[PDB]
Amino acid sequence: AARDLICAQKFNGLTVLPPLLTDEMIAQYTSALLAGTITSGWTFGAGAA
Amino acid sequence: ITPGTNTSNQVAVLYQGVNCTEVPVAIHADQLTPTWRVYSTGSNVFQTR
Ligand SMILES: *[C@@H]1O[C@H](CO)[C@@H](O)[C@H](O)[C@H]1NC(C)=O
DSSP: OTTOHHHHHHHTTOOOOOOSSOHHHHHHHHHHHHHHHHHHTTHHHHSOO | OOOOTTTOSOOOOOOTTOOGGGSOOOSSTTSOSSOSOOOTTTSOOOOOO
16 A cells, blocks of 8 residues: 555545446447448448448 | 436445445444445345446
């Protein structure tokens, strides 16, 4: 604990909440956007890819 | 965690940033501040990040 500021923060009531979307989910979103762009251009932004 | 009281009175409880093994179970009413008890082992237990 002594060599970590996070433990002192926690012990004094200051905590960090995790994001709702994980990094894996965000990477899935970006890969879907990339696949749409390189396979269908701008059509998937306006309707069906 | 609740749906509306207009839907149900059932709730779930999230103990934030703790392991399910270290979840406070206190048979005595003077060794824990929340006085209500939701049976950890009895009810459904899931461990999220
Ligand atoms: C909860 O504790 C057990 C035993 O100490 C450990 O193996 C497990 O990894 C802990 N939970 C998480 C989510 O790390």
